Every structure is written in structure tokens, then in C-alpha cells.
From a paper:
The gpJ protein, comprised of 1132 residues, is located at the bottom end of the lambda phage tail, serving as a key component of the lambda baseplate.
The interaction surface is significant, with an area of 6195 Å2 buried, a PISA calculated energy of –4.9 kcal/mol, and further stabilized by 45 hydrogen bond interactions.
Numbering used by the authors:
A (entry chain F): 713 to 922
B (entry chain Z): 818 to 975
C (entry chain J): 871 to 975
């Protein structure tokens, strides 16, 4: 019977956990069954009944919104082959914590979206001293017979041959799990003010990644 | 604040509404309505609520600003119901966000403050370099203090 | 109301200064709340009201706060602008380099 893996390495990542095992005795003829769980189960015999079946391979990566930073998640790993399954081994893994890395991941996700290429990455207007406001709310069906909806107000201006663009948008698009919503604000100064008793001092000012 | 939002006008307007029921049915909506309530006072609200249906389940997102009449006076409320709220500074064509809120978590770059009230503070990491817990514990690797350390007990190796 | 005014509103503008065009998004409202409706969630995760911000778990790169408190009267731990650190216990895996010490035992 195949032995339980000697070690399990779990590379963290932004909303994702990697899992690769390593055995003391090398054997390329065996596969590894991986299961995922959020909460620890005292019993080990019902892990196959109370844990999600991540899959079976030599290594796996679980990447989903459900996995959160700063939280501990459990992986149940076993070695299988033509003989039979082996003992289940526990592993604890967490996602990354770097806010800079998560913001880079969010920049990538926003770029890989419809509002990312709508409020940004458009070169409308080309002549100097030209500005336009454009407020549109459109719902349309994509090539995958799913419906994506959006509403955006975009201000673009040109000066000395350079493009300055700002926008406020709210959309819901289609992802591999279903539909996901998003609210984008692209501006050089984002201010929240409480106007009670004639108060003008803002209580939240975001500008220049500060 | 969840309770106060539920006992408001937008809570059952931007949410709690199940318009459209069949699969692949998506509605884009935007209204601007001001009306007098039963208390003989005006309440106003402007909203963009966009909804979709899939596999019999409802996904509703929305932006909404209102002002309603409380007993003492008029309360104004701005609400954003969405799965991911992102702020981006487009200066010199920047795309890296500086405020991303998603799933009861807020990710930010450097931030300046006046007073913070947090029970748990962590440096981030398997074994955090430094941590502060609600039980008064300060965990760190080294402590350089330019003045006095007044403690009830101490346990040093050397 | 009774001779006093109430004004609220949102606005995105692009204005001009000597440097060029500057954008600005502004929200004037007594209570600004962000709610994630995933799986029918209704608990807000960012509520700003009255010069005070209430948030859940937050991830950061650098914080600049001259006052940090654990909450409660007799707070558990606190850091104050005079460099004071008030705590109930402290484990340090390395060295404590202090200019003076006062310990009972």
C-alpha cells in the first residue's frame, strides 16, 4: 500500500492556496487526492463526507473568492495508486496578506473586466481643448448567452495633446460561477463629507494611493 | 448600522425586491422619485438598481442616495450595494486601485489617521512579526525603548 | 424643515487649474455605507458617519496613526503620541533595549 506523503507544501496566493505533496520515497506512479475544508473536523473517517472534493492530481491550486486572507483553511491529502487509497493527512494553509499584492491582483481583475476597458483604456477625443460628458446605462447579452448590465458616467477632456479621464460606474458581469457586481470610481480625489450643521471638513479623502 | 439601513427607504428599495423571476432576465433601472409620506413630510431618493436572474436566483446591485424624515430631522443616506467597490486614481494612467472593498474586507495602501480603535492588530504572516491582541498581549521580536520599562514582572534569559 | 435647510448629493467633476485638468468625486451625505449582498448579506462593511468610520477586518501597507487604542474604558493596550505603550503582557523573542527598568520581580 502507498504510504502517506511525508510533507505537504502550500504556497499562499491572493485568494488562492496551492498544494503539492512530497514523499520520502519517490514514486512517479502514484496520484494524490486533495480535499478542501473551511472548518476543522475532529473525526478523520468522515473527511470524505464533510469536505469538498478538490480533485486528484500530483498538485492542485484552489483559487476562489471564498478563500479569504487572514483565515486558516484545511486540506486533506491522500496518496492513491492502482493498489488503493492511503491514510488522510491534514494540512493548514492561508492566503497571502500583502495589501500591495492584493491591490495588484485587484488591478488585474478590474482590467480584465468591462468597466475597466470602459472608464479607462479608451482614447475618445483627440483635439486639444475638447471635453465630453457621457452617461449611458446599457444591458446586453454576451457571446456566452449571458446578460451583462452596466451604468456609467464618464468625463473625458484633452489638453496639450494628453487625455484626462474620470468615471463612475456600476455594473454586473458574467464570470465562470455566475454573475458578479462591481462599483468603480476613477477620479483624482474621492471625498466623503458630512454636511450636518454646515460641516465642510471631509471625513474620508482618498487621493494618490493615500 | 445594518438595522438602521433595514429600517430605511433604500433598504427595501435597492434590496428586498425580487423584480424579474425567469432565467436570463436582466433589468436595468434608474429612478428619481420624491414623495410625501404618511407623516406629511417629503422623502426623496435617486437610485440605479440593476438586477439579474440566473438558475432561479436573484443578483441585485445598486447605487442609491436618499434623504428621509426622522423624528428629530432629515437624515441623508448614500448606499452602494455591490460585491466589489473599487477606487482608482487615473493619474498618469494608473490602474492600481487604492481602496478595494469586497466580502467584508477592505484593502488599502498607506493611510493617515487621527485615532484608531482596533482590538486586534497584526503584521501579517505565519507567526506575525508583531501582534497586539484584545487580552493586552504585545508580541514582537525586539523592543527598543528610549526611556523606562515599568513592569510588574520580568523573565529574561540574560 | 422649520426654516433650516438639508442638502445631500453626489458629483463627479473635471475642473481646470494652472497645472491642468483635475478630476474629483464627491459624496455629501450624513451616512455613507457599503454593503455586499453576496448570499443575501445585509451587514455593511464600511459605514462612515459623523467624522467616524466603522469597518471590518482591513488589510494595509502602512498606517500613520498617532493614537491607537484597544477599546473599552481602561483599554487593554494603547499607543499614544508621547511614545507611551500601555499593555498587560509582552512577549519579545529577542532583546529589550531600554534606558531604565522598574520591575517588582
Amino acid at each position: 500500500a502507498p504510504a502517506a506523503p511525508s510533507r505537504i507544501e502550500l504556497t499562499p496566493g491572493y485568494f488562492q492556496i496551492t498544494a503539492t505533496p512530497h514523499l520520502a520515497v519517490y514514486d512517479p506512479t502514484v496520484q494524490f487526492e486533495f480535499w478542501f475544508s473551511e472548518k476543522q473536523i475532529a473525526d478523520i473517517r468522515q473527511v470524505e463526507t464533510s469536505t469538498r472534493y478538490l480533485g486528484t492530481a500530483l498538485y492542485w491550486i484552489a483559487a476562489s473568492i471564498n478563500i479569504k486572507p487572514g483565515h486558516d483553511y484545511y486540506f486533506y491529502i491522500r496518496s492513491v495508486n492502482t493498489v488503493g487509497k492511503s491514510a488522510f493527512v491534514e494540512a493548514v494553509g492561508r492566503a497571502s496578506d500583502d495589501a500591495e499584492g492584493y491591490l495588484d491582483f485587484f488591478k488585474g481583475k478590474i482590467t480584465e473586466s468591462h468597466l475597466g476597458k470602459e472608464l479607462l483604456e479608451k482614447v475618445e477625443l483627440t483635439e486639444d481643448n475638447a471635453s465630453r460628458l457621457e452617461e449611458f446605462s446599457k444591458e446586453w447579452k454576451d457571446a456566452s448567452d449571458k446578460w451583462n448590465a452596466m451604468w456609467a458616467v464618464k468625463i473625458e477632456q484633452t489638453k496639450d495633446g494628453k487625455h484626462y479621464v474620470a468615471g463612475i460606474g456600476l455594473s454586473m458581469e458574467d464570470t465562470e460561477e455566475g454573475k458578479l457586481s462591481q462599483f468603480l470610481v476613477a477620479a483624482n480625489r474621492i471625498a466623503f463629507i458630512d454636511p450636518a450643521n454646515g460641516n465642510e471638513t471631509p471625513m474620508f479623502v482618498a487621493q494618490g494611493n493615500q | 448600522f445594518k438595522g438602521k439601513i433595514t429600517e430605511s427607504h433604500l433598504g427595501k428599495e435597492l434590496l428586498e425586491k425580487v423584480e424579474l423571476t425567469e432565467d436570463n432576465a436582466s433589468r436595468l433601472e434608474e429612478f428619481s422619485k420624491e414623495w410625501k409620506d404618511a407623516s406629511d413630510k417629503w422623502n426623496a431618493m435617486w437610485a440605479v438598481k440593476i438586477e439579474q436572474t440566473k438558475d432561479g436566483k436573484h443578483y441585485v446591485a445598486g447605487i442609491g442616495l436618499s434623504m428621509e424624515d426622522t423624528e428629530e430631522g432629515k437624515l441623508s443616506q448614500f448606499l452602494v450595494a455591490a460585491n466589489r467597490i473599487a477606487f482608482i486614481d487615473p493619474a498618469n494612467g494608473n490602474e492600481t486601485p487604492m481602496f478595494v472593498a469586497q466580502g467584508n474586507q477592505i484593502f488599502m495602501n498607506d493611510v493617515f489617521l487621527k485615532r484608531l480603535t482596533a482590538p486586534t492588530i497584526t503584521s501579517g504572516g505565519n507567526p506575525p512579526a508583531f501582534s497586539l491582541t484584545p487580552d493586552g498581549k504585545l508580541t514582537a521580536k525586539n523592543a527598543d525603548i528610549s526611556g523606562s520599562v515599568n513592569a510588574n514582572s520580568g523573565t529574561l534569559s540574560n
